[PDB]
Every structure is written in structure tokens, then in C-alpha cells.
Amino acid sequence: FRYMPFSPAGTPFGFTDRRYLTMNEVGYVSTVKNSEQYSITVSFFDVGRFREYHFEDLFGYDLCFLNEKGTLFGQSKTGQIQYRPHDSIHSNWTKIIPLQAGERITSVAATPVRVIVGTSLGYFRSFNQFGVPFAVEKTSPIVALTAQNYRVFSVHYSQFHGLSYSLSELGTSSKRYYKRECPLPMSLPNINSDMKKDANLDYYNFNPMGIKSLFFSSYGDPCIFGSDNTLLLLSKWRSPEESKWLPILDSNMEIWKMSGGKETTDIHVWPLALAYDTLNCILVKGKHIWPEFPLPLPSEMEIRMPVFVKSKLLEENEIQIPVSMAAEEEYLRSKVLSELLTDTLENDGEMYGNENEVLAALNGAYDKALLRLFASACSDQNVEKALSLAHELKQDRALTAAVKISERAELPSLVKKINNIREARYEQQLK
């Protein structure tokens, strides 16, 4: 297996002379073949904040990572890296990473406060924003890195384990692991023999693992987006025995729904970032599944739990979703986000300053969606299913709503049982 230089949302040259080195919510970085050298351009989506600039690359940077304070560049073969702060306050700095025979830099990452370099031999080298080195660590061969503030999400690959991941924090003194080389259940690309003349084969030669991008969400949860075009989010990562990967968006299904229930072959999603409940992306129209020049305007795609079936969606008819059917997904989606956000606040606290209100509204949508399912169960005379739903309610005022719905459905036995839940919770509350 050949380790290829990886960068988030990077594209191959393909049959052209230009490509994107990396790409996210901050902006995009492209490189163009300039005879015997290269022209690197760093562009931003917030043109008001930052000013697009460009420079000449005499080294052949094939690795990149972009954050809000600077841009990191890497050369996979010579091991040369360079960090370029956006603002003139701090100077650019260049470093040469030690590389053994055949050892390549496979991925680089940078936050405003940390710089990380991973190699094909599993060497994990970290620095601060000024180039002051941390201890050098040996891990499994690294294929992908991303970072946010002081935390690093790394993907490893061997011919032994397959794909694994680590989740760590780069403290003042040393590296602490939240999760160390746990299984990474991302689907790998299934390349065929007819793919040898396929138009998109060039991508999987450029990116064998099919990791289109990976990142922390805005609230700090690890995400990954592979060739199956499904956004995977890591849940409960602070509790090693509870950590689970959750599929929270099937972009193929969303495109299908956007197209009014029609199968397409010319619309693709390129993942940039996840902001709370919305996937920031590029909608790629064309033969190739990666974006090209000029770059389209970023789109927004709300996450949806993959619980919808195409056949049932067609019967109930952009595709229209019946309120009862939409309630199941909304309950599940709220349940996941509420659980994630709660863990964040109880451990890290607020980050932007409105999370508690976000969480509060979230829990409101949760109970509200749950009550709709409750009503439907009441409608179908299903007292048992309704009672199970009522147990999943959060707010006591929501329990009250359940009682009123039960009364309107003329189910007095259900009313007493729900009132018992209220009583049972009051007892536990006094302990």
C-alpha cells in the first residue's frame, strides 16, 4: 500500500494543471503548475476579514492545512514545512522534518496554537505556533490529521489493523489521549475493473482511503466524510467505553430528495465543515466528484438521520415529507445533538456564548417532536407504544402536554400511567 499526501478536502490535478491543496469553512488553497515551479493562492470566504494572496512555490508543496490565523504548507518528500500567519504580527517560519529512507509526510495540521506533522512511519511531531517542538512520538502510520485548538484527531492505517483513530490533547508539557487507536468504521472505496477507465479513478489514486475530508465540528466533535458520502460523527468520546460513531447525514439521499426523488449522476457533495446541525459544503456539478475552477459558492446542507426510505418517500408524494414520518427523524436528530451538546457543556462549558440557549431550544424541539409520535400512537389506540414514548420525554411540562393529549384521545388508563412518571421523577429528584 502506498501512502499518499493527505489534506482536508484536497483535490487531484486530474487532467488539468491546477488543483486545491485544502479547503474548509475558512477558505480554500489552490496551486497551479507554473512551468517548472508552482503558484499557490490562498483565498477566503469572508473577504471582509481576510485578503486573498498568492506566492511562488519553488518547493512543490503537496500538503496543506488552513486555519483562521495562518496556513501550513508541507512537502511530502523533502520534509519541508512552512507556517504562514495571515496577519503580519508574527513572521513566517520554515522547518525541515527528519525523514528516513522511504518515509514521507502523509498529513499536516495547524491550529492557531498548534502545528502537527504526521509521517508514513507513524512519527507524530508537534510544535507551537512559533515552531517550538514538543516531544516526538511513535504511533501507527498516519494517513490523516486534523486539529482544533489544542486537540488532534488522527487516522492511522496498517496492513494489520486497517483503519484506526486517535483523539488527543496537546497540553503545555505533553500529549494526553482521550482515545488511542480505536477502530475507525469508515467504509473504504470499492474500486472495480471498469473503474480503470472511469472519469473519477484519478481521485482514488490520489486518495486511496477515499477520505474526502475530516474535521472537528464547531462544537468540538470529530467528524469524517468518506467515499460513501456519509458524514460520520464520533459521539461520547470522553467516555472510552461509550464512544460510538454516528452516521448523521447521507448526502446521496439528500441530493436525491433535492432532485425531487430523481436519481442523478452529475451532482456531488464536497465537505468543508460541520456547524452545529448544518454541513458546509460545495455542490459539485459535472463529471468529476471533486470541485474545480472556478469554485462555486459554498452551500448549506442540514444533517438528517438516515432513517428515510426512498420507496416510502415517493408514496407520500423537492420531495415532501409527511409530518408523522418527519417526526421520527426529528426526534432522533434532536436526541443525538442534545446528547452531544450536553456532554460538551458539562465538560468544556460554552465556546461561543449561546450554547445553553441552543441546548434549551434543542430540548424543546426534542419533546415537541416526541409528542407528535406520542399523538400518533394515541391515534392508533396503541397505549403501550405511547407510554414508552412518554418515558423518553425530558421536560415535566412536556409530560403535562402528554397528559392533555391522552385526555383528548380518551385514554384514562394512559393518563394515570403518565402521572405516575411525574411522581416517580419527583421521588428521584429528592435524593
Partner: peptide, 13 residues
């Protein structure tokens, strides 16, 4: 069964 009126009461809280 319509519960829109019951849901509205829960929102105002």
C-alpha cells in the same frame, strides 16, 4: 388528532 393548540401552550412556557 390535532395537538397544535397543546404544542403552542408548551412553547409559551
Amino acid at each position: 388528532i390535532n395537538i397544535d393548540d397543546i404544542l403552542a401552550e408548551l412553547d409559551k412556557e
